[PDB]
Amino acid sequence: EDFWVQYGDEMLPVIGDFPRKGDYLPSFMLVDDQKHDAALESFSHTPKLIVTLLSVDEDEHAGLLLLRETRRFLDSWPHLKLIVITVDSPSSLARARHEHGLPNIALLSTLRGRDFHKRYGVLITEYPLSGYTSPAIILADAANVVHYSERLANTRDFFDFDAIEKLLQEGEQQA
Amino acid sequence: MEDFWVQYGDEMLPVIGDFPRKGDYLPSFMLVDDQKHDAALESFSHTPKLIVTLLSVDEDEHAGLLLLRETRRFLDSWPHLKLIVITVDSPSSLARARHEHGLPNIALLSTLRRDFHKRYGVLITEYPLSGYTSPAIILADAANVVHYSERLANTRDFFDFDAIEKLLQEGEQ
Ligand SMILES: [Cl-]
Structure with a gap:
């Protein structure tokens, strides 16, 4: 195992x-919360923060709390x-949006092709998280370079937002 | 050209x-329940069963919660x-739905681990329902015979409960 x-x-x-x-993001073919096809090209000309969560219906285990901390980070x-990817159905992602707001956050489901998981290195196959996307964060620029x-x-942890902040500040103080 | x-x-x-x-035996399946436990046919031993595929427990009128509730109402007799409900929803979403919508006894099974979909003839591949289980109902006995x-x-229709009731009544007589 890696x-x-x-x-x-x-x-x-x-x-x-x-x-x-330094990698270019792998291509993906996902489906968003309104059941529309979503590819990298759907998010053209913008930098992005991709996050895989276990599910929008988890709380402490890589779910809504972690999403919240990530939203708070992004106030700056x-x-x-912010592009959230999970194994949840589009219907459940739509319900999460309805119930929690999640302004300007894309919510994408892996149901149209679960091979996203292996291609992004987030595949879990063992009980009890079999089929889920392991929680991860990826900052990419508008060219989709990582x-x-x-x-x-x-699963209870948060991402290293301080490390991401330092990279973004370093880029800003360059430009 | 489709079937x-x-x-x-x-x-x-x-x-x-x-x-x-x-007259068919249920095909085997390997699903995951709302508490993240493996669920196979043999998990539902010594019992007749009504298997329902829905689009999602988080749909309302489109083969979702309204159809689920009508099905459970029918089963009260x-x-x-x-009642075994199968969807593409995550276990996590199924567990939340169970609490949110008051569904204490139903088995709620996720297909997340489409092998099931094709083996049960409920697979959709086309936009906008690509990857969903098409809605269906199967009545099976404790031998898993259909x-x-x-x-x-x-997707907005109800199952033909009248036809199911008639078979169950003809059975009890
Ligand atoms: Cl119930």
């Missing part, structure tokens, strides 16, 4: 090649498009 | 695979029939 995520008392392999700094970086990527080693 | 179609609003979509018929099966032709 990677493990801790979920309560279980330690589960995470499978596939997770994108790294309004030009960064500047930062991290997979969580434990 | 079956489902109407979803103004969209008419092919449904793919071999749908179980009267048939205390031995276990007594009645129906795929909805339109």
Whole structure:
């Protein structure tokens, strides 16, 4: 195994090649919360922050709390498009939007092709998280080149937002 | 050229695979329940069952919660029939729905691990329902033998409960 995520008392392999700094994002064919096809081209000419969560119906285990911390981080970086990807159905993603708002956040489901998981290095095949996307964050520029990527080693953890902030500040003070 | 179609609003979509018929044994499945536990046919031992595929527990009028509630209402007269609901929803969403919508006894199974979809003849591949389970109902006995099966032709329709009731009544007599 290349990677493990801790979920309560279980330690589960995470499978596939997770994108790294300097990589171009792998292509994807997903479906959004209104059942529309979503590809990288759907988010053209914008930098983005891609986040995989276990599901929008988890709370402490890589769910709505982590999403919330990520939204809060992005108060400082309004030009960064937040793209949330999960195994949830489009119908459930639409319900989450209705119930929680999630302004300007894209919500994408892997149901149209679950091979997204291996291609993005977030595939879990063991009980109890079999079929889920392991929680991860990827910062990419408008050319879809990766500047930062991290997979969580434990589902209760938060991403290293301080590390992402430092990269964004360093870029800004350059320009 | 298709064997079956489902109407979803103004969209008419092919449904793919071999749908179980009267006298068939249920095909095996390997699903995951709303508490993230493996669920196989043998998980529902010694019981007749009513298997329903819905689009999602988070749909309302389109083969979703309204159809689920009508199905459970119908089953109130048939205390031995276990209701098993299967969707593409996540276990996490199914668990939330159970609490949010008051569904204490139903088995709620996710297909997240489309092998099921095709083996049960409920697979949709076309926009905008690509990857969903087409809505359907299967009545099976404790031997897992099918007594009645129906795929909805339109997502806003109800199953033919009258036809199911008649078979169950003819059974009890
Ligand atoms: Cl119930």
